[PDB]
Amino acid sequence: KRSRKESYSVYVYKVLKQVHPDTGISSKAMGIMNSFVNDIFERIAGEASRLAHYNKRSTITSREIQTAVRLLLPGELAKHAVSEGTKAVTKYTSA
Amino acid sequence: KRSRKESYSVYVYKVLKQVHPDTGISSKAMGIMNSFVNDIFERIAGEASRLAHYNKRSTITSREIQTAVRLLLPGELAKHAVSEGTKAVTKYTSA
Amino acid sequence: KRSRKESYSVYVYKVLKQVHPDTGISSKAMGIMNSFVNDIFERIAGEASRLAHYNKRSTITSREIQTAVRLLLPGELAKHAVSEGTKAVTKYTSA
Amino acid sequence: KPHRYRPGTVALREIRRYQKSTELLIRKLPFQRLVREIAQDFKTDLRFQSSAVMALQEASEAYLVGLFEDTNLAAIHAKRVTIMPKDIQLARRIRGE
Amino acid sequence: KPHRYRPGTVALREIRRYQKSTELLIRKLPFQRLVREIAQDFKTDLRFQSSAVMALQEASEAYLVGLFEDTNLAAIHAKRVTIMPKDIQLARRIRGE
Amino acid sequence: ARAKAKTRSSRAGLQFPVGRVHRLLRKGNYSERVGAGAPVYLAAVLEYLTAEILELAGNAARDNKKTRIIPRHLQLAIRNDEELNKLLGRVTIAQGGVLPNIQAVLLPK
Amino acid sequence: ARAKAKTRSSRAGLQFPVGRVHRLLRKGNYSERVGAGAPVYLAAVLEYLTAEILELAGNAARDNKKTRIIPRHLQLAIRNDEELNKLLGRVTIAQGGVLPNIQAVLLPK
Amino acid sequence: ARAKAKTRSSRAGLQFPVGRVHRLLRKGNYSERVGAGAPVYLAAVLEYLTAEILELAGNAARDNKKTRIIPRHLQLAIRNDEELNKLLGRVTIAQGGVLPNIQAVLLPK
Amino acid sequence: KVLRDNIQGITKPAIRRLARRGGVKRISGLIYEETRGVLKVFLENVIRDAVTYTEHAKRKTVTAMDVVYALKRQGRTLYGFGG
Amino acid sequence: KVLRDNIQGITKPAIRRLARRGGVKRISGLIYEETRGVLKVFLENVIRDAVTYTEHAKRKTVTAMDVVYALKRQGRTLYGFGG
DNA sequence: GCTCTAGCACCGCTTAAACGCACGTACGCGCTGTCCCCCGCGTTTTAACCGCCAAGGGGATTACTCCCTAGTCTCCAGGCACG
């Protein structure tokens, strides 16, 4: 008997095949991507919590992360991310 | 009232509100965009018809337009176009 | 068991014997004539289709392909083709 | 002595001004007279939309600036700067007519 | 002294002989192998009939030779009988690539 | 008891119509039958091209410190881009003029 | 019980096919419908064009003292007509080579 | 009697899980309320990040002509980009080594 | 009613403005009449087509839509009046 | 199986014979390199198009019919191979 | 899924193509003079632009009613395969 350990397996595999169908994966690289997504997630999450404390809002909306991604993410990366999330949330509200 | 002269009006304004919320649109620039969409749609539709006759196909699906985008649009734009078109058809299959 | 291939073989040979009874013909020249007939037929068909598109006409008429002859076929051969086509439709409807 | 700019300096200023400029470079009513004249050569008593005159204007000037860009390349090809009829004939013969 | 012509006379004979000539100017086997070289540069295990190799052949002399009429019109524009590469890429640019 | 009329463009998550593009493919007379991926794919490539060129148009307008897009900005935006130029070599923009492309030897020393 | 089978090209007094060109337009997807005089006119145009180029081809074969037409004769025929060159200037030929065209300064002396 | 299941990732057209990130923000204990657009926004941000870095890593793997991505490819991918360098200056990569960085004085001559 | 000379109505300094838009610094004196000629010839090339659409439409008035169609037939497609 | 550098298989005297058909009297030694380069460019375009045609047709052998289709697309229509 | 056929693979002579060197002649082009020709600017004219007003030709729309045209069943006959 084994307990399942959660990871970011199929999502990184699918996004790689969406960007490069003919490029393979090694498992140590897969661990590096697991640690990357966990690290950046906790960075944004902690910054969002600090903003919620800071403006005394009891909530984290899309606007808090919008603020947080010009906080941590730089510039063109941040503005492309803002655009991606903006179109994502418009598709989400349309669905 | 008069008969409706169909155009791409509201679509060009909403895609601009996605990509640049603050800038405005002139009627001349909007006519340029209408004639651009007319030209590119005409080119891709005509080449799709060409591939329909050429492979003796009565059917034109996304695969022939992927063929046509690989034909007409050069390189960087071609693979970019294939990427968001593939994302679009996957979300179409997932409705 | 092989498949029939559609060509312009005896037709071009007949009009060849009408314009020059005593001469011969090669197969490479026949490929040239077959591709020529296909290309000019396609050019006239494409301009006729575009003309029917422009003037919202859902049918291909002899008047608008005559227009297409004025368009693609230049100068004096255009009016010779007009004479030939009008004569041909005259003895066709009289038939 | 009244001030006089050197030959070519005002030419370059015209170049910079008119590359920066976007407006029409032909008087519109003599253009309309000419296009009505040449239309009358092929079909009598034709009428022109003013927007159609503008479209023929912009297509014509676009054709001309493309040909002149070609002849500038032909002139710098020929180790010269004064464009010549041989440059225009060359550009048209290269373009395939 | 042995028999030897002035420069250009044999060139004129070459020009006349291969404007008269209808047969193929380039070798078959290295052309087919070069087609295969570009083929596996794009997708591996790609095959060609001899007729397709002939078709790319005919396209190659058509395209290249047409560039040479455009090129020597450029060369006679530049008052020269010797062509230089700048004629070729300027001709390609005027053609509208 | 019919389902709510929800749009195929939002099914694509896109803005250029599946409906209008499919209609002009059907009535443009290009094939007898048209697959469902065809109008969504072609609307997607038009939306990509439109977004890219209005990105360059907006940057061109803000470079000229102006707010509203003009065909001067459009023509500038087209011939900064090599693959757009190769796409639109034979197309002339209304009131766009010519981008400053000045050959060097005719410039003064 | 039935009328005798009569070819429409000979009804028009032409050799080129009313039937094959009509069916090929109807399956070529250029409109939904075709007028009755349209493929007769198209066949007449094609027969005229082929008659002209074959007349010049027979002339070229007689000039070369040959009986059977060669694509060299066809290229010689097309490039020696200015209006056919205006029709087929961008068309490349199989085994036709080039028309004899030596320039003024290319010739010696 | 029940609506068919659609994931929020398919509603947003993302393939990172919206629900997983929403859970992990609930149980990451960062606020007692979280706006609904927040986790899908964050998942889209990581989607852009992972897509960017997998473009870079796949391109690097093609450049060293290896089919499978390796942490060396990842470490070249991060360290050859400036803004990812600022994003991950203080990050250790297992078996990624160091970017090829030789100073100009270390070269001979 | 009839017009005989409006090719000279496209003035020489207007051609100079066009050539400055074409980036020409120095223009020969023999250029201007040739530009009149080539613009003239181009206008037959365009307007026979445009009149041909117009007489296909059973109309008498030239429209800009047919101008766009004639220009795109020659592969010089004009943006700004289609649709 | 794999080849590296067969582009010189189109030999220099082949290019000379081509220019003799093109009516070039004197061909500089600098010329042959960009002729090979532009020939690479043109064939790269044509074979890209042709490979796209064949991969659309789910085949593994290029036909000359697809070649003349690629020549229809790019604007160098060729006669005589069943187009 | 089958099949069958020309491309792929491998094999064996044959000098034409290639190629390379060497003599030779022509080729491009810079300097510089020389001649010439069109731009810059000033001045003068004049209709272009503006702006303002009358009028009607036909573009466009709606309706009507009829010309026509693909489709299909069927039949037969000339073009294609084959020699």
Swiss-Prot record, chains A, B, C:
The modification N6,N6,N6-trimethyllysine is found at K56. It comes from the Eukaryota. GO terms for biological process: antibacterial humoral response; antimicrobial humoral immune response mediated by antimicrobial peptide; defense response to Gram-negative bacterium; defense response to Gram-positive bacterium; innate immune response in mucosa; killing of cells of another organism. The nucleosome is a histone octamer containing two molecules each of H2A, H2B, H3 and H4 assembled in one H3-H4 heterotetramer and two H2A-H2B heterodimers. The octamer wraps approximately 147 bp of DNA. The modification Omega-N-methylarginine is found at R57, R63. Belongs to the histone H2B family. The modification Dimethylated arginine is found at R50. The modification N6-methylated lysine is found at K87. The chain holds residues 31 to 125 of 126 of the full protein. Monoubiquitination at Lys-5 (H2BK34Ub) by the MSL1/MSL2 dimer is required for histone H3 'Lys-4' (H3K4me) and 'Lys-79' (H3K79me) methylation and transcription activation at specific gene loci, such as HOXA9 and MEIS1 loci. Similarly, monoubiquitination at Lys-91 (H2BK120Ub) by the RNF20/40 complex gives a specific tag for epigenetic transcriptional activation and is also prerequisite for histone H3 'Lys-4' and 'Lys-79' methylation. It also functions cooperatively with the FACT dimer to stimulate elongation by RNA polymerase II. Phosphorylation at Ser-7 (H2BS36ph) by AMPK in response to stress promotes transcription. There is a cross-link at K5, K91 (Glycyl lysine isopeptide (Lys-Gly) (interchain with G-Cter in ubiquitin)). The modification N6,N6-dimethyllysine is found at K28. This is Histone H2B type 1-K. It comes from Homo sapiens (Human). The modification PolyADP-ribosyl glutamic acid is found at E6. The modification N6-glutaryllysine is found at K5, K14, K17, K79, K87, K91.
Curated annotation (Swiss-Prot), chains D, E:
Disulfide bonds: none annotated. The keyword Glycoprotein does not apply. The modification N6-crotonyllysine is found at K20. Keywords: Acetylation, ADP-ribosylation, Chromosome, Citrullination, DNA-binding, Hydroxylation, Lipoprotein, Methylation, Nucleosome core, Nucleus, Palmitate, Phosphoprotein, Ubl conjugation. One of its GO terms (cellular component) is extracellular exosome. The modification N6,N6,N6-trimethyllysine is found at K20, K43. The modification N6-lactoyllysine is found at K20, K43. The modification N6-acetyllysine is found at K20, K43, K79, K86. The modification N6-(beta-hydroxybutyryl)lysine is found at K20, K43, K86. It is found in: Nucleus; Chromosome. The nucleosome is a histone octamer containing two molecules each of H2A, H2B, H3 and H4 assembled in one H3-H4 heterotetramer and two H2A-H2B heterodimers. The octamer wraps approximately 147 bp of DNA. During nucleosome assembly the chaperone ASF1A interacts with the histone H3-H4 heterodimer (via C-terminus of H3); this interaction is direct. Interacts with DNAJC9, CHAF1A and CHAF1B. Interacts with NASP; NASP is a histone chaperone that stabilizes and maintains a soluble pool of Histone H3-H4 dimers. Belongs to the histone H3 family. This is Histone H3.2. It comes from Homo sapiens. The lineage of its organism: Eukaryota, Metazoa, Chordata, Craniata, Vertebrata.
From Swiss-Prot, chains F, G, H:
The modification N5-methylglutamine is found at Q95. The modification N6-(2-hydroxyisobutyryl)lysine is found at K27, K65, K66, K86, K109. One of its GO terms (biological process) is chromatin organization. The keyword Glycoprotein does not apply. There is a cross-link at K4, K6 (Glycyl lysine isopeptide (Lys-Gly) (interchain with G-Cter in ubiquitin)). The modification N6-succinyllysine is found at K86. The keyword Ubl conjugation applies. Residues 1-9 have a biased composition (Basic residues). It is involved in the initiation of both imprinted and random X inactivation. Ubiquitinated H2A is enriched in inactive X chromosome chromatin. Ubiquitination of H2A functions downstream of methylation of 'Lys-27' of histone H3 (H3K27me). H2AK119Ub by RNF2/RING2 can also be induced by ultraviolet and may be involved in DNA repair. It is found in: Nucleus; Chromosome. One of its GO terms (molecular function) is DNA binding. GO terms for cellular component: CENP-A containing nucleosome; extracellular exosome; nucleosome; nucleus. The modification N6-(beta-hydroxybutyryl)lysine is found at K4, K27, K86, K109. The nucleosome is a histone octamer containing two molecules each of H2A, H2B, H3 and H4 assembled in one H3-H4 heterotetramer and two H2A-H2B heterodimers. The octamer wraps approximately 147 bp of DNA. Core component of nucleosome. Nucleosomes wrap and compact DNA into chromatin, limiting DNA accessibility to the cellular machineries which require DNA as a template. Histones thereby play a central role in transcription regulation, DNA repair, DNA replication and chromosomal stability. DNA accessibility is regulated via a complex set of post-translational modifications of histones, also called histone code, and nucleosome remodeling. Belongs to the histone H2A family. This is Histone H2A type 1-B/E. It comes from Homo sapiens (Human).
UniProtKB/Swiss-Prot annotation, chains I, J:
The nucleosome is a histone octamer containing two molecules each of H2A, H2B, H3 and H4 assembled in one H3-H4 heterotetramer and two H2A-H2B heterodimers. The octamer wraps approximately 147 bp of DNA. Found in a co-chaperone complex with DNJC9, MCM2 and histone H3.3-H4 dimers. Within the complex, interacts with DNJC9 (via C-terminus); the interaction is direct. Interacts with NASP; NASP is a histone chaperone that stabilizes and maintains a soluble pool of Histone H3-H4 dimers. The modification N6-glutaryllysine is found at K12, K40, K58, K60, K72. The modification N6,N6-dimethyllysine is found at K1. Changing P13R: In TEBIVANED3; results in early developmental defects when expressed in zebrafish embryos. The lineage of its organism: Eukaryota, Metazoa, Chordata, Craniata, Vertebrata. One of its GO terms (biological process) is protein localization to CENP-A containing chromatin. This is Histone H4. One of its GO terms (molecular function) is structural constituent of chromatin. One of its GO terms (cellular component) is chromosome, telomeric region. The keyword Secreted does not apply. It comes from Homo sapiens (Human). It is linked to Tessadori-Bicknell-Van Haaften neurodevelopmental syndrome 1: An autosomal dominant disorder with onset in infancy, characterized by poor overall growth, microcephaly, hypotonia, profound global developmental delay, impaired intellectual development, poor or absent speech, and characteristic dysmorphic facial features, including hypertelorism and abnormal nose. Other variable neurologic and systemic features may also occur. The modification N6-propionyllysine is found at K12, K25, K58, K60, K72.
